[PDB]
Design a protein around this ligand. Structure first.
Ligand SMILES: Cc1ncc(Cc2c([C@@H](C)O)sc(CCOP(=O)(O)OP(=O)(O)O)c2C)c(N)n1
Ligand SMILES: Cc1ncc(Cc2c([C@@H](C)O)sc(CCOP(=O)(O)OP(=O)(O)O)c2C)c(N)n1
Ligand SMILES: [K+]
Ligand SMILES: [K+]
Ligand SMILES: [Mg+2]
Ligand SMILES: [Mg+2]
Ligand SMILES: [Mg+2]
Lengths: 324, 365, 38, 324, 365
């Protein structure tokens, strides 16, 4: 049952196509080609073109097509080739589908899931690796899910697809097939808006999501060699945040840092930090610091190494908080 | 030096978009060969609705000035392109209206009192009754076009023999979503009717500054779908264009773009300085003689189908129905933060669950 | 000129103690209890 | 002379059109009509259709236009009728002009200023009052400014038009004509990125921007009747933040709250709480609380009154912080 | 029931868009009237550049599979559509290229070692030399079209007798930006030339599923501007089309849309695309014979203006230069995070000043 994250993704899509006749998969090059990273491979040939198809090149169009289909009872699962391209579909996502239930007082709803890869570390061209989770996180009516392991990916996508409200599912490029993990075959779900402890610690709480989780765990092993026991928490849903799990952990360690790949003035670290300060203020022993990238535009491929935060920056920031 | 036939090219496309008309400004039939098939009782019903809709506009303006209605966009002068177009649809057809297309959804099933709540800004006004196939008016110009291609592709997939119809204005044809919408409908060969109401102005911008194209109907060419330009003050013509477009769609032949040439007798909206924004008034009198009610009136009287006694009846009926709808809008209870939160999701996420208890209490005493 | 954060601040105010009098062994936290005792 | 905010904006545009032949004003109905709220009244008649003109109805095109113009040496001052329509132009603003200097290693730059009204409390139809400055605040390479007074409005616009990098000038709909204020005739500038103290206080710091400054001042006058001295600081630039002024003020009072009109999950309040916490947490006597609207879509017109944060909300929260 | 002449509309309209051709497959002149005024020396320079661009394409692919280069979009097969179009321009003209149009900006003045830096992902690759009017390749499909209308409007306001030229693909014609651009350009009557390179594919998707329009050139009718379809494998026809467009534009007559019918013999991009999964192998041999280098070579050899001796001299000069560009890109100093901060703004705001200090220390160890 060893699978890479892209395989768990495909398997979760295969399952939902079987159980729910209303599910449809579409976007640019997702039919006969199977996608840029082969996420939808083999699906069209098994479920038919009437359920898995290519569309004209136009994100704004794909988003407007998804809303309409939902009004006719279908459960759409469109794809934006890269999340850097979400600026073209901003109105359909935030000005439309996220507000349909509220706008119609519950008469209509959008059982829609938007799949899209992001993240850096594999040297892609301009606007492909951007981290824009913070934009959609500010629109009420949406749920933003970001998995970090093959196991979390399959179960979250199924819950996402089953959700009767819009959900944005971001898949990190560097985690697609970089590692393997045990994934049970068959349907199973993981609640949306629920975080999980990836490593139990006692000295400090390290909160992260996406590819930063790996770096955090990487950093936790090094720190163990120095007597500092770190607790690593993976959010897995960046909106809503699992306040109880976050707080529960901080009111035990009394210290913490938040880790993200995005620019400091971007991302979601600011909201987690704000929330911690308002609820666990009486348990803190040190200020809650963030580990983020510089406030410049996402770097030209060649400069990813020196720009992207890695486990060494998490080692350093963790020591600052401990030596406070 | 070599010269490309660019001048001839623009002339040949123009020849392909002549203005379609059945009734001239006098009520005379100038196109027998295309006269639609309508019984005596359907023509009377088409007139009653147009007169009724004209009365609605006058009261809506009055009520808005009295502060009894909120946002409102005048429809007077556009009854043919609005009412006669909706008259060609069936109960199962889906309507995706614009901010100015409130009449259409009223006739398709949306209770009149709920249209006043929409104006005032009340969620109950948007809660469309089940089975009535419509969306609340769309404010973002162009969004309703890409959305209709979706509803349409949907009907095609369920096998249902219905159509998705949507409306936009001349200014709207400039938006990229307008283009993506009709092109997407064409690529999928979906049953969609796209209507563009050309009343010559986008707020204060004349259509001649919107594009250097001579007809808005020729824009259908970039999508590869049939385009038709019709007289927007001609009831029978707009009825025939949509009907032909309906048949074509339900037979799986694809979408059609319809440009109507109408005009507005009142302000852009009633929101700000709009009621006092510059109006030509030399241009108003001219289009005043072209009034849809005027010519259709003479068309029916010549056939002994309309008396000045039925007109008064419909006018008193619309005035009374309007008075009780505005009354019923007053009786609907005020809204609370809890009502607006309960309709954000099916299952409330933690942040809203917590926020629900805070406003619950701040409500009860 | 008084460094303590932040529950130390609320804990001293709840016990009727002025944080300025105490000598923070480490900006207090458990040495406020030592103040109340002596 | 005594001026309203809309009059201060008008005079600043005139000062700039006259001092620099490269400046151009354009957008939907900004010409002969003079704009929806008369902001550009009389400019086209004075400077000609070559400097002040109208365009087809398409936000995306207005944004692209501004980019090309600036590649040709001009200094564009484009206009979006209402900021709720920015979704339509997100790519040009954030995916293009804010990255051009960076993308060309300095070779080209974008001396552009976008003007746009926003804000609630005036009963407008859907998507006209939303507060989305949180979105633009997340893109490196932009500066977002939001005046609250006529004086600040004139000085900032002039400063925004002269800057050689992209600036978004948000003008609150409710503040356009709510009060007059003495405003010096002629040119003068207010630095971008500098907050200022509206009311001096010693017991609690109230941080606000836009139309919330007024509400905060009304709460401050109420808090005074009970002996509570509140200091009201107006940000006036939400990106970048004037850290030095904010932190310097909170360290003096020890207590602070942040106020925004935008929903809790949006706005820039979280960023403010985060910077405060990591720089002066050792001075905080209580947690920095937030006053914000429910995390729902912007309300239907009739419920604005019970949904938008007013001075009473500010008072209740301010007390909560004093009695923590 | 009454019927509208829809089928005749779609036919007549596309009749106005026949393929413009000068040189056929065997290199014979089939259109003497439109023959351009080019000297024997200009003809040899057009060939030298096409042979050179083909060699650059083969060398790029090779250096990419060696890791020497990064992102790369093959251009083999589109030499005429790209090089002969550029030949019709002058130094003052402004080019807004897309990701595959790196050849055009090279010939327009960008040092070849900088193109390779653009591929690797280094900011110095994008620092265009002053006086060379180009933008770095645009990655977001559509964006260069709405930016071209601005540039064009800019050149017009200053009174310059120059044009803005921009390129995109068949898939790019479906974007909302594609339509707003040529529509804005038309409404303002600005000197912009919009070139569409129809290589029959958008990554793996065939153009037949993008739209139902008979041709892509007809999409200009939506904006009301003239459009021309030409043989993209015909260098003498691309040059003439762009020549007539440039002249019309500098004479203040507006923009023009040019659709070239070409083909790409190579992968969509060098990332991992494999053509055998979506297009016939026998379909790659149908366009193999329509190679622009082959026909132009025969045309010249028929006038005694080309020998294999001159061709190998160009092949040599090409390899030699490619080799030098590659060594120059390697000698370029590595990129630093302080270098990325310094080019963000003219005057650094507070948050970047802090970070600048923070990263200035981390870079000194
Ligand atoms: C994307 C976008 N931009 C701007 C507006 C503001 C706006 C209106 C408000 C209502 O949002 S009404 C209107 C003019 C529409 O002109 P038209 O297309 O000719 O239609 P008509 O003449 O029937 O109004 C605009 C620009 C909008 N609604 N949506
Ligand atoms: C808005 C948007 N969507 C998707 C992409 C991804 C993408 C490319 C990468 C580069 O981002 S190349 C390409 C296909 C373009 O096909 P075309 O227009 O026919 O051009 P050509 O055949 O010359 O490649 C897409 C969809 C993009 N760049 N921009
Ligand atoms: K969903
Ligand atoms: K500026
Ligand atoms: Mg109009
Ligand atoms: Mg768009
Ligand atoms: Mg192509």
């Amino acid at each position: 049952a060893q699978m890479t994250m892209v395989q768990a993704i495909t398997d979760a899509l295969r399952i939902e196509l079987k159980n729910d006749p209303n599910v449809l998969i579409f976007g640019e090059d997702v039919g006969v080609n199977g996608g840029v990273f082969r996420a939808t491979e083999g699906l069209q040939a098994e479920f038919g073109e009437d359920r898995v198809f290519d569309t004209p090149l136009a994100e704004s169009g794909i988003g407007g097509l998804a809303i309409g289909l939902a009004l006719q009872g279908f459960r759409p699962v469109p794809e934006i080739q890269f999340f850097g391209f979400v600026y073209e579909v901003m109105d359909s996502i935030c000005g439309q589908m996220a507000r349909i239930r509220y706008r119609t007082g519950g008469r209509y709803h959008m059982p829609i899931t938007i799949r899209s890869p992001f993240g850096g570390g594999v040297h892609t061209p301009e606007l492909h690796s951007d981290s824009l989770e913070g934009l959609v996180a500010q629109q009420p009516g949406l749920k933003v899910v970001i998995p970090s392991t093959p196991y979390d990916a399959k179960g979250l996508l199924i819950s996402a697809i089953r959700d009767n409200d819009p959900v944005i599912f971001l898949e990190h490029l560097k985690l697609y097939r970089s590692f393997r993990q045990e994934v049970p075959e068959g349907e199973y779900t993981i609640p949306i808006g629920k975080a999980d402890i990836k490593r139990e610690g006692k000295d400090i709480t390290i909160i992260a999501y996406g590819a930063m989780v790996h770096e955090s765990l990487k950093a936790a092993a090094e720190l163990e060699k120095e007597g500092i026991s770190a607790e690593v928490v993976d959010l897995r849903t960046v909106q809503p945040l699992d306040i109880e799990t976050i707080i529960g952990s901080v009111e035990k360690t009394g210290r913490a840092i938040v880790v993200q790949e995005a620019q400091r003035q971007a991302g979601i670290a600011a909201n987690v930090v704000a929330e911690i300060n308002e609820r666990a203020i009486l348990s803190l022993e040190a200020p809650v610091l963030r580990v983020a990238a510089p406030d410049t535009v996402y770097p030209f491929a060649q400069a990813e190494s020196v720009w992207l935060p890695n486990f060494k920056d998490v080692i350093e920031t963790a020591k600052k908080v401990m030596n406070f | 030096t070599f010269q490309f036939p660019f001048a001839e090219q623009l002339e040949k496309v123009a020849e392909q978009f002549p203005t379609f008309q059945i009734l001239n400004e006098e009520g005379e039939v100038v196109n027998e060969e295309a006269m639609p098939e309508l019984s005596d009782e359907q023509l009377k019903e088409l007139m009653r609705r147009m007169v009724y809709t004209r009365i609605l506009d006058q009261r809506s303006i009055s009520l808005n000035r009295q502060g009894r209605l909120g946002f409102y966009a005048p429809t007077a002068g556009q009854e043919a392109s609005q009412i006669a177009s909706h008259f060609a649809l069936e109960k199962e057809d889906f309507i995706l209206p614009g901010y100015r297309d409130v009449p259409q959804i009223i006739w398709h099933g949306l209770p009149l009192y709920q249209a006043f709540l929409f104006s005032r800004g009340h969620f109950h006004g948007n809660q469309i009754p089940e089975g009535v196939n419509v969306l609340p008016p769309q404010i973002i110009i162009g969004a309703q076009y890409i959305q209709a291609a979706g509803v349409a592709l949907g009907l095609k997939m369920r096998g249902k023999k219905a159509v998705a119809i949507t409306y936009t204005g001349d200014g709207g044809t400039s938006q990229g979503d307008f283009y993506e919408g009709i092109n997407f409908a064409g690529a999928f060969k979906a049953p969609a009717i796209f209507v563009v109401q050309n009343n010559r102005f986008a707020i204060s911008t004349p259509v001649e500054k919107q594009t250097v194209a001579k007809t808005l109907a020729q824009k259908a060419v970039a999508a590869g779908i049939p385009g038709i330009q019709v007289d927007g003050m001609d009831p029978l013509a707009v009825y025939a264009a949509v009907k032909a477009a309906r048949e074509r769609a339900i037979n799986g032949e694809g979408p059609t773009l319809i440009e109507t040439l109408c005009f507005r007798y009142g302000p852009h909206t009633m929101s700000g300085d709009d009621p006092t924004r510059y109006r030509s008034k030399e241009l108003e009198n001219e289009w005043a003689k072209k009034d849809p009610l005027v010519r259709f009136r003479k068309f029916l009287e010549a056939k002994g189908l309309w008396s000045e006694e039925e007109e008064n009846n419909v006018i008193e009926q619309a005035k009374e129905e309007i008075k009780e709808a505005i009354k019923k809008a007053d009786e609907t209870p005020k809204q609370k933060v809890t009502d607006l939160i309960s309709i954000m999701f099916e299952e409330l996420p933690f942040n809203l669950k917590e926020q629900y208890e805070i406003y619950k209490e701040k409500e009860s005493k | 000129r008084v460094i303590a954060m932040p529950s130390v601040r609320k804990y001293a105010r709840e016990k009727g103690v002025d944080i300025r009098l105490v000598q923070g062994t480490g900006k207090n936290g458990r040495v406020l209890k030592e103040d109340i005792d002596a």
